[PDB]
DNA sequence: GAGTATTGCATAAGACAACAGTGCACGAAAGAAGAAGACACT
DNA sequence: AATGTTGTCTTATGCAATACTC
DNA sequence: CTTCTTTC
DNA sequence: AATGTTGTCTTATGCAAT
DNA sequence: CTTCTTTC
DNA sequence: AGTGTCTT
């Protein structure tokens, strides 16, 4: 049956259940036949990726431009968020230039303070010599991303949800439909980012401004296990941050801290 | 604090968790406040009951065109599947014409038999008076689809993902990567259709041939309950088909048969 | 019924038994209608070539007939090659399944190594012989006459005198196969499709066992519905139907 | 839209509710327009409301219209529930002309349960008895001109006459309406008095006749915590329900928890 | 049920769908009844496009000409009689069918001198109706003639029908076609015409548009299991969309 | 009074999203409406 | 050089407190 | 006889 | 007029031999 | 001192 | 000297 099944899959590439039933082969073997085939293994998962987040506020920032035509003429919205505090700062601009990046960054620093590093995309206004000189002056490390995959920029584009879903609702509330009047744009914006920092975020236990100015940093965390490349669970780690998607775990022997998917962490003892 | 919370949401449109905590209101009330707001319409009521299925073999067919450049210059693949037996029939054509549709349906009839009804999407070939007058002589019911949002012919469009992949796997297996030579295209077709229809489809207990020529039609099914618009569970129904996604259920008092989502059916007693 | 049957024969030229059954007409009338018309398993297969000047440019027609179910499969070609035999055979196996053996003539297209290894990978026996023996090559020959007759008859019925353009050829062969396969032939009271597949509609489910309160597995049940969480199984004797957890059901034998 | 509405009434003499809706004019203005019209002050008014639905009890009579000569006999039939007027012209009041008129009224409004007529000669004949018996519609005679048996059609006749007269005076027909335009004129009057709103109601008469198509009803819990009657639910999907107010037909969506059966 | 259907067909020769609904009979019996009798592309909105055509029937002498107009969407029909072929007859018949059904938006006609005359030209413009003059129109003519033969031979009229008997049979025909069936359908032409309109206003909905956005401003007119018919409040355009693509407005 | 249906309420339990600068660009196919020359109108 | 995000949306259980039905 | 339009 | 669908895909659980 | 390649 | 539907 094993050779007959191999020949059958060679010619027809029959799935494993059919070969297992037809030739009376156990499922592990039939699956082994599909696995050993080069063309039929065209769907392995091989998925991973952590945003990542910072262990404390004013450490990791993310910034990107988004287009909200309601703010016309200055329809470009530069959005920035701290990964630890989840607090949002936004300004309006008419053109996406490095001047707008250093201006917006100047405002966000004027509100929340100076961050350790800002994580942007591969845009031309962020990769300009002038921007590198600006962050060279303010001492902020620069981290770009994949060319076209904003998944790593997730928790800033996630902000672009609120900033665009809150501006819609608040603008419709004051009776503005096609374009927000220029006299009330500042009020709209101020109330907008006012509602998203001093007040909780749905099921969030604290407010983003409280998580900003009064963050929770564990000195030494509780012990956890992590699932390592071979699929095994390894003791000897402690967790410092455990969020919804991902957790930050620290190795006990070195104090190195890494971010891993939640599914790959379980309590140690 | 019902009015205080309402005012807070009026101005800032604060979520229910925040208003419930801030104004000490129970959950149901705060949620009612968010619900009662028009510009915060959640909504999210989109009726999920959606069922494109038929009862018996040769009763309801699905037919659509798709592009696979491996068969060029005749790369146009016409696909027709029987919704009850899941038996696929595909024919290659250089250009999508009503004559090509009548040729395809002529072959699928020459293999499976004359169907009672065929459901397609409203294209140029199907909505022509010529194809209409062709189904006229053969007595086959014609059912078009929504202009653009083709999610109902899915069990044929999904068939393309079942089809074209089995093409590639058979093409790469024979050393043909870019375009399959004209001499072996038809053999590729026959080998694909024989691999799909004459063997189990993954977890399928019967083969499409065993499901077509030896189908299983229940004289009368076991009793079930269905969840009705008000959310209640109503007795007095019997289930005739219970698949992975959807179920066909029959009303005991009238013998009227309707299709409903699996999640909306449970055993009666 | 008389006019409906006449129209049916006009278009498809269906034999008299099929028209008699379909339109509920007695034998003498249906047969008289055929007279009044001017133009009127899986054990061993017989494959042969036949040329039809009416299917130009690709006028070669490959025919395969099952010796037990009398099915008919046809594919058009432009020239007889060793590849054409394996292509047509691939189509036939795709249609009606893999047979056990095929009988052909002493032609080079059937006896070449290119065809031999093809029949070897699929496990199909082959026995050649005299080109036209009565053991033999007689049945597939009758299939060729029937097929060519039906081709010229349906063609001249739709208004195609001698040459059918390249567009409607596959449609012609399609309708021909439909008539000669899904309808009764001559005086035979069953269709070749029914002779090949035995289309028995299953009135119930396959047999299963259910785990009873004492933990034992009890035979004598068949399952009719398997929904989320639970399964409906029917007792074959009393026809009582009960619902039980999926985990409490396993195949019987 | 004041001038457009004025022109509309000039030609068709449409009631105020219809002009108010068609040209988006407030009620007080439209009513002032109807007041300023001379033939809208004759008037007469046919609507003057039981609890039975359409096709329950009809009324049928004959009236004279010398302008419609030679076919000067107008057979009028109106519904006592939906208030729909159907009329055809004849040369003489016969027993077969009532079968023709009623046969016409069947093809447009369906078959009623009964038809109340007077003691006229053509209503108690043998031919009318055969036709009425073939169509299975009940019939009751009565006194010609009392206050209960013959109530609405008495006004319906003057409605029709003082409608065709006015629509004809607008085209230049004063002494006698020509024969080639008899059915055309009559048709214009019917389309003016059936498909359009007349008086002040919540639905147009043509809608009044064709809505046996509705809620359970339901009650909804209003902001003050009270339960308010007067709504019907038309759609109940996952999470929310659409309910319609019976007095206005306004439809709003509310949470499922806020709905319970009314009575 | 068998006797009720047989009597109904004996007198009116009613099609099988109507007898099946009226007497609660399955399709096979009613169809068998229609068989035993010897004398026996979809549209999107009513009152929008009509199709008028002339037809001749010498049995209706001296006014042998007829005139049939059909609402193509709601499967409606209306017929009148005329003596000669002129323009005032066309304007007369249209003026009647308007009162029968309601002011249509456009009416398709045939090639003819009566439809192009000056008076007929500006008559439709006076009522604000479009003229196009554009296969399946003549079905209503034979539709009318077969039913006329059915009821005429039902009451015993074989020869030429008197002038004082034509109208009653016309109304008997139009009633015998509008209220019963169209031969194969599931809903009477009246509900296809008169009762999508009686719905005052549906509930508000949003629809997901090509760009993925949700657009306010629509009301739903028909809500079935799979699909809903929704009407734009600003334009009255009606489209059919998947249930999953609709959510409540406010 | 005592058993019980039901209301109040709180999580939790699967999920659904849309965030990515704008999406409209082109093409075939089948069917319907607008435009230039010709020979009647007057 | 440099990784997918949470903010909500409905319904499904487990336990106090009215409002009922004997 | 062109474009113009609705779908795939 | 006319309804998001399944065949894989990985990693966790119940019946019988060294 | 204009015209391409990158990315958003 | 003005235009008008029909053919395509
Ligand atoms: W070629
Ligand atoms: W070639
Ligand atoms: W070729
Ligand atoms: W030759
Ligand atoms: W030759
Ligand atoms: W020859
Ligand atoms: W020859
Ligand atoms: W030759
Ligand atoms: W020759
Ligand atoms: W060729
Ligand atoms: W060639
Ligand atoms: W060629
Ligand atoms: W060739
Ligand atoms: W070729
Ligand atoms: W070639
Ligand atoms: W060719
Ligand atoms: W070719
Ligand atoms: Zn393989
Ligand atoms: Zn709000
Ligand atoms: Zn014949
Ligand atoms: Zn007036
Ligand atoms: Zn009949």
Coordinates of N, CA and C in Angstrom, one line a residue, chain E residues 46-223:
Chain E
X46 N -42.7 49.0 -11.5 CA -44.0 49.2 -12.2 C -44.2 50.6 -12.5
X47 N -45.2 50.9 -13.4 CA -45.6 52.2 -13.8 C -44.4 53.0 -14.4
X48 N -43.5 52.3 -15.0 CA -42.3 53.0 -15.5 C -42.2 52.8 -17.0
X49 N -42.3 51.6 -17.6 CA -42.2 51.3 -19.0 C -43.4 50.5 -19.4
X50 N -44.2 51.0 -20.3 CA -45.4 50.3 -20.9 C -45.1 49.9 -22.3
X51 N -45.9 49.0 -22.8 CA -45.7 48.5 -24.2 C -47.1 48.4 -24.8
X52 N -47.5 49.3 -25.8 CA -48.8 49.3 -26.4 C -48.7 48.8 -27.9
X53 N -49.7 48.2 -28.3 CA -49.8 47.6 -29.6 C -51.2 47.4 -30.1
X54 N -51.5 47.5 -31.3 CA -52.8 47.3 -31.9 C -53.0 45.9 -32.3
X55 N -54.2 45.4 -32.3 CA -54.6 44.1 -32.8 C -56.0 44.1 -33.3
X56 N -56.2 43.3 -34.3 CA -57.5 43.2 -35.0 C -58.3 42.0 -34.7
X57 N -59.6 42.1 -34.5 CA -60.5 41.0 -34.2 C -61.8 41.3 -34.9
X58 N -62.0 40.7 -36.1 CA -63.3 41.0 -36.8 C -64.5 40.5 -36.0
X59 N -64.4 39.7 -35.0 CA -65.5 39.3 -34.2 C -66.1 40.5 -33.4
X60 N -65.4 41.6 -33.2 CA -65.8 42.8 -32.4 C -66.4 43.9 -33.3
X61 N -66.8 43.5 -34.5 CA -67.4 44.5 -35.4 C -68.6 45.2 -34.8
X62 N -69.0 46.4 -35.2 CA -68.3 47.2 -36.3 C -67.0 47.8 -35.8
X63 N -66.7 47.8 -34.5 CA -65.5 48.4 -33.9 C -64.5 47.2 -33.7
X64 N -64.0 46.8 -34.9 CA -63.2 45.6 -34.9 C -61.8 45.7 -34.4
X65 N -61.3 47.0 -34.3 CA -59.9 47.2 -33.8 C -59.9 47.2 -32.3
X66 N -58.7 46.7 -31.7 CA -58.5 46.7 -30.3 C -57.2 47.5 -30.0
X67 N -56.8 47.6 -28.7 CA -55.6 48.3 -28.3 C -55.2 47.7 -27.0
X68 N -54.0 47.2 -26.9 CA -53.5 46.5 -25.7 C -52.3 47.2 -25.2
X69 N -52.2 47.5 -24.0 CA -51.1 48.1 -23.3 C -50.7 47.3 -22.1
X70 N -49.4 47.1 -21.9 CA -48.9 46.1 -20.9 C -47.8 46.8 -20.1
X71 N -47.9 46.7 -18.8 CA -46.9 47.1 -17.9 C -45.9 45.9 -17.8
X72 N -44.7 46.1 -18.3 CA -43.8 44.9 -18.5 C -43.2 44.4 -17.2
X73 N -43.1 45.2 -16.2 CA -42.6 44.7 -14.9 C -43.6 44.0 -14.0
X74 N -44.7 44.6 -13.8 CA -45.8 44.0 -13.0 C -46.6 43.0 -13.7
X75 N -46.4 42.7 -14.9 CA -47.2 41.8 -15.7 C -48.7 42.2 -15.8
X76 N -48.9 43.5 -16.0 CA -50.3 44.0 -16.1 C -50.7 44.1 -17.5
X77 N -52.0 44.3 -17.8 CA -52.5 44.4 -19.1 C -53.8 45.2 -19.1
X78 N -54.1 45.9 -20.1 CA -55.3 46.7 -20.3 C -55.7 46.7 -21.8
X79 N -57.0 46.6 -22.1 CA -57.5 46.5 -23.4 C -58.7 47.4 -23.6
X80 N -58.8 48.0 -24.8 CA -60.0 48.8 -25.2 C -60.4 48.4 -26.6
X81 N -61.5 49.0 -27.1 CA -62.0 48.7 -28.5 C -62.2 50.0 -29.2
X82 N -61.9 50.0 -30.5 CA -62.0 51.2 -31.3 C -62.5 50.7 -32.7
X83 N -63.1 51.6 -33.5 CA -63.6 51.3 -34.8 C -62.6 51.5 -35.9
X84 N -62.0 52.7 -35.9 CA -61.0 53.0 -37.0 C -59.6 53.2 -36.3
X85 N -58.6 53.5 -37.1 CA -57.2 53.7 -36.6 C -56.9 55.2 -36.8
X86 N -57.1 56.0 -35.7 CA -56.7 57.4 -35.7 C -55.9 57.8 -34.5
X87 N -55.6 59.1 -34.4 CA -54.8 59.5 -33.3 C -55.7 59.7 -32.0
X88 N -56.9 60.2 -32.2 CA -57.8 60.4 -31.0 C -58.1 59.1 -30.3
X89 N -58.1 58.0 -31.1 CA -58.3 56.7 -30.5 C -57.1 56.3 -29.6
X90 N -55.9 56.7 -30.0 CA -54.7 56.4 -29.2 C -54.7 57.2 -28.0
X91 N -54.9 58.5 -28.1 CA -54.9 59.4 -26.9 C -56.1 59.0 -26.0
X92 N -57.2 58.5 -26.6 CA -58.3 58.1 -25.8 C -57.9 56.8 -24.9
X93 N -57.3 55.8 -25.6 CA -57.0 54.6 -24.9 C -55.9 54.9 -23.8
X94 N -54.9 55.6 -24.2 CA -53.9 56.0 -23.2 C -54.5 56.7 -22.0
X95 N -55.4 57.7 -22.3 CA -56.0 58.4 -21.3 C -56.9 57.5 -20.4
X96 N -57.3 56.4 -20.9 CA -58.1 55.4 -20.1 C -57.1 54.6 -19.3
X97 N -56.1 54.1 -19.9 CA -55.1 53.2 -19.1 C -54.4 53.9 -18.0
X98 N -54.2 55.3 -18.2 CA -53.6 56.1 -17.1 C -54.5 56.0 -15.9
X99 N -55.8 56.2 -16.1 CA -56.8 56.1 -15.0 C -56.8 54.6 -14.5
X100 N -56.6 53.7 -15.3 CA -56.6 52.3 -14.9 C -55.4 52.0 -14.0
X101 N -54.2 52.4 -14.3 CA -53.0 52.0 -13.6 C -52.3 53.2 -12.9
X102 N -52.3 54.4 -13.5 CA -51.5 55.5 -13.0 C -50.5 56.0 -14.1
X103 N -50.1 57.3 -14.0 CA -49.3 57.9 -15.0 C -48.0 57.2 -15.1
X104 N -47.7 56.6 -16.3 CA -46.4 56.0 -16.5 C -45.3 57.0 -16.9
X105 N -44.1 56.5 -16.7 CA -42.9 57.4 -17.0 C -42.6 57.3 -18.5
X106 N -42.6 56.1 -19.1 CA -42.3 55.9 -20.5 C -43.2 54.8 -21.1
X107 N -43.5 55.0 -22.4 CA -44.3 54.0 -23.1 C -43.7 53.7 -24.4
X108 N -43.4 52.4 -24.6 CA -42.9 51.9 -25.9 C -44.0 51.6 -26.8
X109 N -43.9 52.1 -28.1 CA -44.9 51.9 -29.1 C -44.3 51.2 -30.3
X110 N -45.1 51.0 -31.3 CA -44.6 50.3 -32.6 C -44.5 51.3 -33.7
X111 N -44.2 50.8 -34.9 CA -44.2 51.7 -36.1 C -45.6 51.9 -36.6
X112 N -46.1 53.2 -36.5 CA -47.4 53.5 -36.9 C -47.6 55.0 -37.0
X113 N -48.6 55.3 -37.9 CA -48.9 56.8 -38.2 C -49.7 57.4 -37.0
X114 N -50.4 56.6 -36.2 CA -51.2 57.2 -35.2 C -50.3 57.6 -34.0
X115 N -49.2 57.0 -33.8 CA -48.3 57.3 -32.7 C -47.4 58.5 -32.9
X116 N -47.2 58.9 -34.2 CA -46.3 60.0 -34.6 C -47.0 61.2 -34.9
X117 N -48.4 61.2 -34.9 CA -49.1 62.4 -35.3 C -48.9 63.6 -34.3
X118 N -49.0 64.8 -34.7 CA -48.7 66.0 -33.9 C -49.5 66.0 -32.6
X119 N -50.8 65.7 -32.6 CA -51.6 65.7 -31.4 C -51.1 64.6 -30.5
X120 N -50.9 63.4 -31.0 CA -50.4 62.3 -30.2 C -48.9 62.6 -29.8
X121 N -48.2 63.3 -30.6 CA -46.8 63.6 -30.2 C -46.8 64.5 -29.0
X122 N -47.5 65.6 -29.0 CA -47.5 66.5 -27.8 C -48.5 66.0 -26.7
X123 N -49.3 65.0 -27.0 CA -50.2 64.5 -25.9 C -49.4 63.9 -24.8
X124 N -48.5 63.0 -25.1 CA -47.7 62.4 -24.1 C -46.8 63.4 -23.4
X125 N -46.2 64.3 -24.1 CA -45.5 65.4 -23.5 C -46.3 66.2 -22.6
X126 N -47.6 66.4 -22.9 CA -48.5 67.1 -22.0 C -48.6 66.4 -20.6
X127 N -48.7 65.0 -20.7 CA -48.7 64.2 -19.5 C -47.3 63.9 -19.0
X128 N -46.3 64.3 -19.6 CA -44.9 64.0 -19.2 C -44.6 62.5 -19.4
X129 N -44.7 62.0 -20.6 CA -44.4 60.6 -20.8 C -43.4 60.5 -22.0
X130 N -42.4 59.6 -21.9 CA -41.4 59.5 -22.9 C -41.9 58.6 -24.0
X131 N -41.4 58.9 -25.2 CA -41.7 58.1 -26.4 C -40.5 57.5 -27.0
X132 N -40.4 56.2 -27.2 CA -39.3 55.5 -27.7 C -39.5 54.8 -29.0
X133 N -40.6 54.2 -29.2 CA -41.0 53.4 -30.4 C -39.9 52.3 -30.7
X134 N -39.8 51.4 -29.8 CA -38.9 50.3 -29.9 C -39.5 49.0 -30.5
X135 N -41.1 42.1 -29.8 CA -40.8 40.7 -29.8 C -41.7 40.0 -28.9
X136 N -41.8 40.4 -27.6 CA -42.7 39.8 -26.7 C -43.9 40.6 -26.3
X137 N -44.3 41.6 -27.2 CA -45.4 42.4 -27.0 C -46.7 41.8 -27.5
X138 N -46.6 41.1 -28.6 CA -47.8 40.5 -29.2 C -48.4 39.3 -28.4
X139 N -47.7 38.9 -27.3 CA -48.2 37.8 -26.5 C -49.6 38.2 -25.9
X140 N -49.7 39.5 -25.6 CA -51.0 40.0 -24.9 C -52.2 39.9 -25.9
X141 N -51.9 40.0 -27.2 CA -53.0 40.0 -28.2 C -53.7 38.6 -28.2
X142 N -52.8 37.5 -28.4 CA -53.4 36.2 -28.4 C -53.8 35.8 -27.0
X143 N -53.2 36.4 -26.0 CA -53.6 36.2 -24.6 C -55.1 36.7 -24.4
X144 N -55.4 37.8 -25.1 CA -56.8 38.3 -25.0 C -57.7 37.5 -25.9
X145 N -57.3 37.1 -27.1 CA -58.2 36.4 -28.0 C -58.6 35.1 -27.5
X146 N -57.6 34.3 -26.9 CA -57.9 33.0 -26.4 C -58.9 33.0 -25.3
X147 N -58.7 34.0 -24.4 CA -59.7 34.1 -23.2 C -61.0 34.6 -23.7
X148 N -61.1 35.5 -24.8 CA -62.3 35.9 -25.3 C -63.1 34.7 -26.0
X149 N -62.3 33.9 -26.7 CA -63.0 32.6 -27.2 C -63.4 31.7 -26.1
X150 N -62.7 31.7 -25.0 CA -63.0 30.8 -23.9 C -64.3 31.2 -23.2
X151 N -64.5 32.5 -22.9 CA -65.7 32.9 -22.2 C -66.8 33.1 -23.2
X152 N -66.6 33.5 -24.5 CA -67.6 33.5 -25.5 C -68.2 32.2 -25.7
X153 N -67.4 31.1 -25.9 CA -67.9 29.8 -26.0 C -68.3 29.2 -24.7
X154 N -68.0 29.9 -23.6 CA -68.5 29.5 -22.3 C -70.0 29.9 -22.1
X155 N -70.3 31.1 -22.4 CA -71.7 31.6 -22.3 C -72.6 31.2 -23.5
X156 N -72.0 30.6 -24.6 CA -72.7 30.2 -25.7 C -72.6 31.1 -26.9
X157 N -71.8 32.1 -26.9 CA -71.6 33.0 -28.0 C -70.6 32.4 -29.0
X158 N -71.1 32.0 -30.1 CA -70.2 31.4 -31.2 C -70.1 32.4 -32.3
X159 N -71.2 33.0 -32.8 CA -71.2 33.9 -33.9 C -70.7 35.2 -33.5
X160 N -71.0 36.2 -34.3 CA -70.6 37.6 -34.0 C -71.3 38.1 -32.8
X161 N -70.6 38.8 -31.9 CA -71.2 39.2 -30.7 C -71.9 40.6 -30.8
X162 N -73.1 40.8 -30.3 CA -73.7 42.1 -30.5 C -73.0 43.2 -29.8
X163 N -73.3 44.4 -30.2 CA -72.7 45.6 -29.7 C -72.9 45.8 -28.2
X164 N -74.2 45.4 -27.7 CA -74.5 45.6 -26.3 C -74.0 44.5 -25.4
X165 N -73.2 43.6 -26.0 CA -72.6 42.5 -25.2 C -71.1 42.5 -25.2
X166 N -70.4 43.4 -25.9 CA -69.0 43.3 -26.0 C -68.3 43.8 -24.7
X167 N -68.7 44.9 -24.2 CA -68.0 45.4 -23.0 C -68.0 44.5 -21.8
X168 N -69.1 43.8 -21.5 CA -69.2 42.9 -20.4 C -68.2 41.8 -20.6
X169 N -68.0 41.3 -21.8 CA -67.0 40.2 -22.1 C -65.6 40.7 -22.0
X170 N -65.4 42.0 -22.4 CA -64.1 42.6 -22.2 C -63.7 42.6 -20.8
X171 N -64.6 43.1 -19.9 CA -64.3 43.2 -18.5 C -64.2 41.8 -17.9
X172 N -65.0 40.8 -18.4 CA -64.8 39.4 -18.0 C -63.4 38.9 -18.4
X173 N -62.9 39.4 -19.5 CA -61.6 38.9 -19.9 C -60.5 39.5 -19.1
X174 N -60.5 40.8 -18.9 CA -59.5 41.5 -18.1 C -59.5 41.0 -16.7
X175 N -60.7 40.8 -16.1 CA -60.7 40.1 -14.8 C -60.2 38.7 -14.9
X176 N -60.5 38.0 -15.9 CA -60.1 36.6 -16.1 C -58.6 36.5 -16.4
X177 N -57.9 37.6 -16.5 CA -56.4 37.6 -16.7 C -55.6 38.3 -15.6
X178 N -56.2 39.4 -15.1 CA -55.4 40.1 -14.1 C -55.4 39.5 -12.7
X179 N -56.6 39.0 -12.3 CA -56.8 38.5 -10.9 C -56.4 37.0 -10.7
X180 N -56.3 36.3 -11.8 CA -56.1 34.8 -11.6 C -54.6 34.4 -11.7
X181 N -53.9 34.7 -12.8 CA -52.5 34.2 -12.9 C -51.9 34.8 -14.2
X182 N -50.6 34.5 -14.4 CA -50.0 34.7 -15.7 C -49.5 33.4 -16.3
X183 N -50.0 32.2 -15.8 CA -49.7 30.9 -16.3 C -48.6 30.1 -15.6
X184 N -47.6 30.8 -15.1 CA -46.5 30.1 -14.4 C -46.1 30.8 -13.1
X185 N -46.5 32.0 -12.8 CA -45.9 32.8 -11.7 C -46.4 32.3 -10.3
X186 N -45.8 33.0 -9.3 CA -46.2 32.7 -7.9 C -47.0 33.8 -7.2
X187 N -47.1 34.9 -7.9 CA -47.8 36.1 -7.3 C -48.7 36.7 -8.4
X188 N -49.9 37.2 -8.0 CA -50.8 37.8 -8.9 C -50.3 39.1 -9.4
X189 N -50.6 39.5 -10.7 CA -50.1 40.8 -11.2 C -50.5 42.0 -10.4
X190 N -51.6 41.9 -9.6 CA -52.1 43.0 -8.9 C -51.1 43.3 -7.8
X191 N -50.7 42.3 -7.0 CA -49.7 42.6 -5.9 C -48.4 43.0 -6.5
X192 N -48.1 42.5 -7.7 CA -46.9 43.0 -8.4 C -47.0 44.5 -8.8
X193 N -48.2 45.0 -8.9 CA -48.4 46.4 -9.3 C -49.0 47.3 -8.2
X194 N -50.0 46.8 -7.5 CA -50.7 47.7 -6.6 C -50.2 47.5 -5.2
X195 N -49.5 46.4 -4.8 CA -49.0 46.4 -3.4 C -47.5 46.1 -3.3
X196 N -46.7 46.7 -4.2 CA -45.4 47.2 -3.6 C -45.5 48.7 -3.3
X197 N -46.5 49.3 -3.8 CA -46.7 50.8 -3.7 C -47.4 51.2 -2.4
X198 N -48.2 50.3 -1.8 CA -49.0 50.7 -0.7 C -48.1 50.8 0.6
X199 N -46.9 50.3 0.5 CA -45.9 50.5 1.6 C -45.5 51.9 1.6
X200 N -45.9 52.7 2.6 CA -45.7 54.1 2.7 C -44.2 54.4 2.7
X201 N -43.4 53.9 3.7 CA -42.0 54.1 3.7 C -41.4 53.0 4.5
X202 N -40.3 52.4 4.0 CA -39.6 51.3 4.7 C -38.7 51.9 5.8
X203 N -38.1 51.0 6.5 CA -37.1 51.5 7.6 C -35.8 51.9 6.9
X204 N -35.0 52.8 7.6 CA -33.8 53.3 7.0 C -32.7 52.3 7.1
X205 N -31.9 52.2 6.0 CA -30.8 51.3 6.0 C -29.6 52.0 5.4
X206 N -28.4 51.4 5.6 CA -27.2 51.7 5.0 C -26.8 50.6 4.0
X207 N -26.1 50.9 2.9 CA -25.6 50.0 1.9 C -24.1 50.2 1.8
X208 N -23.4 49.1 1.6 CA -22.0 49.1 1.4 C -21.7 49.3 -0.1
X209 N -21.0 50.4 -0.4 CA -20.8 50.8 -1.8 C -19.4 50.3 -2.2
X210 N -19.1 50.4 -3.5 CA -17.9 49.8 -4.1 C -16.7 50.1 -3.3
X211 N -16.5 51.3 -2.8 CA -15.4 51.7 -2.1 C -15.4 51.2 -0.6
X212 N -16.4 50.4 -0.3 CA -16.5 49.8 1.1 C -17.2 50.7 2.1
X213 N -17.6 51.9 1.7 CA -18.2 52.8 2.6 C -19.7 52.5 2.8
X214 N -20.2 52.9 4.0 CA -21.6 52.8 4.2 C -22.3 54.1 4.0
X215 N -23.4 54.1 3.2 CA -24.0 55.3 2.7 C -25.4 55.3 3.3
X216 N -25.8 56.4 3.9 CA -27.1 56.6 4.5 C -28.0 57.1 3.3
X217 N -29.3 57.2 3.6 CA -30.2 57.7 2.6 C -31.0 56.7 1.8
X218 N -31.1 55.5 2.3 CA -31.9 54.4 1.6 C -33.0 53.9 2.6
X219 N -34.1 53.4 2.0 CA -35.2 52.8 2.6 C -35.5 51.4 1.9
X220 N -35.8 50.4 2.7 CA -36.0 49.1 2.2 C -37.5 48.9 1.9
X221 N -37.8 48.3 0.7 CA -39.2 48.1 0.2 C -39.6 46.7 0.3
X222 N -38.7 45.8 0.2 CA -38.9 44.3 0.2 C -37.7 43.7 1.0
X223 N -38.1 42.9 1.9 CA -37.0 42.2 2.7 C -37.3 40.7 2.9

